Amino acid sequence: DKNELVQKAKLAEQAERYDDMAACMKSVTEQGAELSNEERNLLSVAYKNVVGARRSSWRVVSSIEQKTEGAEKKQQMAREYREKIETELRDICNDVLSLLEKFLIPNASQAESKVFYLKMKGDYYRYLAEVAAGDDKKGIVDQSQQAYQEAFEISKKEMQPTHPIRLGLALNFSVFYYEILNSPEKACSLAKTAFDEAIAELDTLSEESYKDSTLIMQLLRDNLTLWTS
Amino acid sequence: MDKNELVQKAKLAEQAERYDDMAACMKSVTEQGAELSNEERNLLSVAYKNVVGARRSSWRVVSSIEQKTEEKKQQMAREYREKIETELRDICNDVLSLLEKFLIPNASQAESKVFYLKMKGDYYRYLAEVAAGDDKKGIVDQSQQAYQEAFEISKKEMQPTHPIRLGLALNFSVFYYEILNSPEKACSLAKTAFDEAIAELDTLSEESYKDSTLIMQLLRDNLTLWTS
């Protein structure tokens, strides 16, 4: 019952149980019908929290693995755990990504929905990239670039420069440039122009998303200052 | 796998904030039958405290929602509480049984006896937080008795400033306030453990002063809170 599955999802969220939360919204999406946008947001929160817990564990242990340059035994132990954490992290990304390919992107009927799910697809391939090594990696990076790019094209054409979603896409796509493709200048100019373009049209801000747009603009500018360091 | 390897795995898991992994490691260390070193003991305690801690904290949130929904919203909140509850009893039963089978019987010196008897008091207390029915009065008394024997062994064999003694008072006092609903016995217990330790700040050491003073601060804060 999509409305039960959704009500439990918010219960899961208040209890800080994001894997339960993510399981509810997963099965909602699987009912094959277009997600509402309170629904869409519930799915995005769940999986961002579920995947983010693994990303953060990965980074801690990956770091231990590098600070233990043999120390072979400690380094072997760290490697093994890293790879165990990776495989949780890949299952999570593949889960999301198959939801995107199978239901959410095909059912997206409005432009804002397509930019949102294509960004999300850019995001989950980027999390796979953070963690890919070798043969896998170029393919994975290409897919992330391609989703962001498509999203970026639609959002430039359809949305106001201060729209939270267009701003967030520019934020994440610029992060992809800097962090995954090691191209800081491209990252800086993508973020600079998204910032400047939103300053040029502050009249387009609305009461109900004012807050998010404003926060993302600040995050754009903070990365820039970090990247120019 | 061998003890020392499992310990290092527990420390990785801890560092990665993956406490279920951490508890699974230390459980299996315990299950080997050897008496736990006290680094190990601490690792077992941290993993399991963080594992039940999450449940305890989700239980409280969903319980709060349940009591305050007056539909079929309440049915859904009840079922979720109960699911959380059952995970949480599975966590306390597990520790409880590792305490009965390995840890309490292997405990050679007074210190470890107090430590584990305390932990047995705590995990019964977590069961008590969550118990309804005929279950309850027995869970409680189990807790009270683990604390009480722990308390006696500490008043006789540890200094007033031992962090493990001080910690028992702190939790024993919480049991009194929160479970037995005896605020007056709780304050008296905390206040005497605070005063006796404060009269001996000298005798603290470098391995223990941070822990002993921090617990002392918490005895006082609880005192402040319960006198309101």
Next chain:
Amino acid sequence: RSTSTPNVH
């Protein structure tokens, strides 16, 4: 570490 888009939310 660069900052990406947080939850609203």
Next chain:
Amino acid sequence: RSTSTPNV
């Protein structure tokens, strides 16, 4: 809410 012994 009362405070119990934290982790070391």
